[PDB]
């Protein structure tokens, strides 16, 4: 029956070539209408699908279920291995969902853990998923707590991470130009990595 339901999701979703709202809405409905211990089993089974759109659905479920530390660890360490970039985009959204549910201030230790993780996809999920960082609670009132955390990744080894880092600072610069200017002025523009991030972050700054 659970297997039958995964088979129905595969039929429903496998031909979708763009977007994520259909998978998201189905996950939200299923999360709200069933007990969490059952939905955890469904999420793990769906995440094993060879249909990446069903894995997207499963990762939305993980986000809704992420108060359970075992689900959050599976997101951090296993979903981050997914070879499909659309699933990676859903991982970022599911991480934002975790932070929204617990509260952004209460989530800071987990944010910091993901930003320091060994898997570049874990680091990127946190940097990208919270964009625009200063539109979220806590960061909106404390913008330097976002700027400092993002700027710490300006030397990241991964280009995928660095693009998210630079664009996350670019977002913030449009509403907090004074604070981003102060941060950028302190950078020593030596490495290839930091120069890539600096160019993205500085477009709207009168340096």
85 carries a ligand binding annotation: yes
Can you tell me which of 1, 4, 18, 206 binds ligand IMP, judged by CB under 6 A? Answer: 18
86 carries a ligand binding annotation: yes
Our finding on whether 84 is near ligand IMP (CB under 6 A) is: no
Cα–Cα nearest to 51, from 8, 107, 13, 77: 13
Which of the choices Cl ion, ligand IMP, none does residue 200 contact, using the CB cut-off of 5 to 8 A by kind? none
Distance in angstroms (rounded) separating the CA atoms of residues 55 and 87: 7
103 carries a ligand binding annotation: no
Minimum distance between the CB of residue 84 and Cl ion, rounded to whole angstroms? 24
**Cis omega (within 30 of 0) for bond into 132:** yes
Cα–Cα nearest to 124, from 116, 135, 132: 116
Can you tell me which of 85, 103, 152, 157 binds ligand IMP, judged by CB under 6 A? Answer: 85
Residue 30 token pair: 């299923």
162 carries a ligand binding annotation: no
Q: At what angle are helices 143-151 and 177-185 packed, to 10 degrees?
A: 30
Our finding on whether 159 is near ligand IMP (CB under 6 A) is: no
Instruction: Please enumerate, by residue number, every residue annotated as part of a binding site.
Output: 18-19, 85-86
């Amino acid at each position: 029956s659970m297997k039958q339901y995964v088979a129905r999701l595969e039929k429903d979703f496998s031909l979708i070539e763009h977007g994520f709202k259909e998978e998201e809405q189905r996950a939200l409905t299923d999360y709200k209408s069933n007990d969490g211990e059952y939905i955890k089993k469904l999420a793990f089974l769906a995440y094993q699908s060879d249909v990446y759109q069903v894995r997207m659905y499963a990762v939305f479920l993980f986000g809704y279920l992420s108060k359970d530390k075992e689900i959050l660890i599976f997101m951090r360490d296993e979903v981050s291995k997914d070879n499909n970039w659309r699933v990676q985009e859903v991982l970022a959204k599911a991480f934002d969902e975790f932070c929204k549910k617990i509260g952004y201030k209460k989530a800071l230790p987990i944010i910091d853990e993901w930003l320091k993780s060994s898997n570049l996809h874990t680091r990127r999920a946190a940097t990208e998923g919270l964009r625009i960082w200063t539109n979220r609670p806590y960061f909106k009132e404390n913008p330097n707590e976002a700027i400092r955390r993002i700027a710490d990744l300006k030397e990241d080894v991964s280009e995928y991470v660095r693009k998210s880092v630079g664009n996350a600072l670019r977002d913030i610069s449009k509403k907090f130009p004074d604070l981003v200017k102060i941060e950028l002025k302190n950078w020593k523009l030596e490495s290839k990595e930091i120069n890539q991030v600096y160019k993205l972050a500085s477009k709207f700054i009168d340096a």
